[PDB]
């Protein structure tokens, strides 16, 4: 391959998401009085927007991502039910349909959170993985990616604290022990609600041709075995079209139970490449080298 | 905030989402979600640019008549597809184009309508008392342009 392009045609538009029962407790930027005590199930309805992120990767192998994940706790310690699970980095292969990170950390929420109530809906049961730029460029063939581009930005909008039990106590030397109405301490953990900034159209990385002349791998863009992968992440063209449908068309007064409400989303792509023909002369000096790269390369040719 | 300019020999071609003809496998109910289909047409003077709400018809696809403001409540926001216009075999649809646009969210709201598709109940844990009933699972943003400048 020599040059690619990735085209879009939907207009540049933000998205939105949020939970009907999201684990908030209170608000923490300004407390006029001290926080009230919390009963059972004090969650509420919050929405937010995700951080703006764009991406493009091109390689002869699938791209390698990472995220945090639970491992096996050490045998010597007594496993009390309700303790903190282990944390360990996990290297997998990314797939279409896997979520990107949203500024909430890159971790499998399924095993690490039993609440199902701390993130919004679309990432609540799926994983979110950040691509490993370190491991892919340290692949000593260079077959994972030829070249890559990225832009991202975020900033804090609101500052909450979560309802839920103190999993690890605060030491009694950090703070002077309170009294009276504040003998019992408030919740220590917080989490921020992220937000992307304004999306514009100077900072687009699509609809532009990308000619490549070199690459940081030794593989100078050669599709071994007649295969090619292209990764595209884009949250800038993410409008959520809201539609309705009416039950009856005869009534003359607005009633709420006559219209059902649905959300649908559209997204579309197209790809255009150039390939240049490349021949290889064959010698036993050369054939041992390709036999060490990959088994199926020399096998598919009948040489 | 949006600006563009197009020069061509033929009229320019637009695109927008629209309702098609569904398969009659299930009988259509009063209040079923209509199907979608990408429709191409010619742009005329008087149609509306997309204003951060999706290039969609707002008569057939939105029968409530109270989800967008007045200017697009009956008109159809169209967006010019550059993909079909550059891929023409002669290139008479356009031969010169420029565009800039920007947008960001100001406020976040709910849709006060019937929940057409409920969330599957493995994605949460059922509460009790005040929170035994789920709030509306439909949100929508209110867009807003940024600063206009002279450069």
């Amino acid at each position, epitope marked *: 391959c020599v040059g690619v392009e990735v085209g879009r045609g939907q207009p540049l538009g933000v998205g939105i998401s949020g939970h009907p029962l999201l684990n908030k407790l209170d608000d923490t930027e300004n407390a006029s009085a001290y926080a009230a005590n919390a009963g059972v199930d004090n969650r509420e309805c919050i929405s937010m927007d995700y951080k703006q992120t764009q991406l493009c990767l091109i390689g002869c192998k699938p791209p390698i991502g990472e995220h945090w994940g639970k491992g096996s706790p050490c045998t010597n310690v007594a496993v009390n039910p*309700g303790d903190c699970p282990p944390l360990e980095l996990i290297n997998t292969v990314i797939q279409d349909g896997d979520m990107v990170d949203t500024g909430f950390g890159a971790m499998d929420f399924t095993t690490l959170q039993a609440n199902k109530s701390e993130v919004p809906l679309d990432i609540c049961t799926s994983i979110c993985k950040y691509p490993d730029y370190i491991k892919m460029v340290s692949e000593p063939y260079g077959d994972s990616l030829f070249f890559y581009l990225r832009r991202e930005q975020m900033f804090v909008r609101h500052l909450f604290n979560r309802a839920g039990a103190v999993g690890e106590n605060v030491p009694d030397d950090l703070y002077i022990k309170g009294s009276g109405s504040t003998a019992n301490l408030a919740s220590s953990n917080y989490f921020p609600t992220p937000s992307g900034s304004m999306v514009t159209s100077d900072a687009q990385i699509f609809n532009k041709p990308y000619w490549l002349q070199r690459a940081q791998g030794h593989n100078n863009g050669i599709c071994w075995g007649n295969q090619l992968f292209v990764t595209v992440v884009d949250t800038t063209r993410s409008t959520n079209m809201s539609l309705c449908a009416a039950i009856s068309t005869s009534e003359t007064t607005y009633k709420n139970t006559n219209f059902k409400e649905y959300l649908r989303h559209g997204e579309e792509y197209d790809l255009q490449f150039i390939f240049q023909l490349c021949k290889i002369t064959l010698t036993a000096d050369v054939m041992t080298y390709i036999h060490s790269m990959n088994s199926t390369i020399l096998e598919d040719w009948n040489f | 905030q949006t600006q563009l300019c197009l020069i061509g020999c033929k009229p320019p071609i637009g695109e927008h989402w629209g309702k098609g003809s569904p398969c009659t496998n299930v009988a259509v109910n009063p209040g079923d979600c209509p199907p979608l289909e990408l429709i191409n047409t010619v742009i005329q003077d008087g149609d509306m640019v997309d204003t951060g709400f999706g290039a969609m018809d707002f008569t057939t696809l939105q029968a409530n008549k109270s989800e967008v403001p007045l200017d697009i409540c009956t008109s159809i926001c169209k967006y010019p597809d550059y993909i079909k216009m550059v891929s023409e075999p002669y290139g008479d649809s356009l031969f010169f184009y420029l565009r800039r646009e920007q947008m960001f969210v100001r406020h976040l709201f709910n849709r006060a309508g019937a929940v057409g598709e409920n969330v599957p109940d493995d994605l949460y844990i059922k509460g009790s008392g005040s929170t035994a009933n789920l709030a509306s699972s439909n949100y929508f943003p209110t867009p807003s342009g940024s600063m206009v400048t002279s450069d």
Partner: antibody, heavy 120, light 110 residues
Framework: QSVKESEGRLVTPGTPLTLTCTASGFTMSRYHMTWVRQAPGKGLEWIGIIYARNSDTYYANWAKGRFTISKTSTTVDLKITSPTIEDTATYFC????????????????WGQGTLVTVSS | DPMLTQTAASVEVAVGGTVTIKCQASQSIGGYLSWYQQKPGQRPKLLIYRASTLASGVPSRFKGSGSGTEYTLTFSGVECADAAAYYCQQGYTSSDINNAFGGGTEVVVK
């Protein structure tokens, strides 16, 4: 701190009955309230619970249809609809001192408790 | 329904003895558990909550332990004013339960 009650009455079965409960220092819209009943022999029996800002209630299994807990910002109280003979016992009102998450049934600062009895 | 039985009438103890009151639970409740002393003439009065943290104005000669489903409460150096009634109590605040958190007594110390 101190928890106060209304004075007891010797009543007849078939008459509604109330006991108000006022507090001294803390405000009641912050914490929770619960009622327990001390019968002779052993008896020590918990009635229900009421929360602070959610203002929800949860009763015992045998106690549904039989008690209604009312609360204002100034006073909490409980109510009896149809008394049966064997509720001649001692009632108590106490504050649920809890934390940012629990609302667990620790009753830290109790009330002094008065005697209510029914007779026919 | 989490149930704490406490089917244990207390044994006669002298001055300075040690008593092991054991309160067992059917369902796992975590650490949320309370204890109370009931003198038979006045209001009840609490000693320890969450099985480890004692309250104000109470001497540190009372002990707290136990985790999971079974818990205990020990102390030593029994005075004259320890003739009271004891009660273990959980905090799982469920709906369909009929707890009453009952059981527990203490003899008059010789």
């Amino acid at each position: 701190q101190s928890v106060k009650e209304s004075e007891g009455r010797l009543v007849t079965p078939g008459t509604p009955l109330t006991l108000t409960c006022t507090a001294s220092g803390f405000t009641m819209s912050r914490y929770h309230m619960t009622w327990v009943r001390q019968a002779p022999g052993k008896g020590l029996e918990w009635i229900g619970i009421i929360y602070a800002r959610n203002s929800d209630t949860y009763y015992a299994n045998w106690a549904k249809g039989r008690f209604t807990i009312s609360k204002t910002s100034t006073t909490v109280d409980l109510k009896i609809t149809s008394p049966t003979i064997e509720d001649t016992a001692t009632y108590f009102c106490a504050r649920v001192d809890s934390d940012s998450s629990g609302a667990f049934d620790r009753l830290d600062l109790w009330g002094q408790g008065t005697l209510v009895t029914v007779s026919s | 329904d989490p149930m704490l039985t406490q089917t244990a009438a207390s044994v006669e103890v002298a001055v300075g003895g040690t008593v092991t009151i054991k309160c067992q639970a059917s369902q796992s409740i975590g650490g949320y558990l309370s204890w109370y002393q009931q003198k038979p003439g006045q209001r009840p009065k609490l000693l320890i909550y969450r099985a480890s943290t004692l309250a104000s104005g109470v001497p540190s000669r009372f002990k707290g332990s136990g985790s999971g489903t079974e818990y205990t409460l020990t102390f030593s150096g029994v005075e004259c004013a320890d003739a009271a009634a004891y009660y273990c109590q959980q905090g799982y605040t469920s709906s369909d339960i009929n707890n009453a958190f009952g059981g527990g007594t203490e003899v008059v110390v010789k």
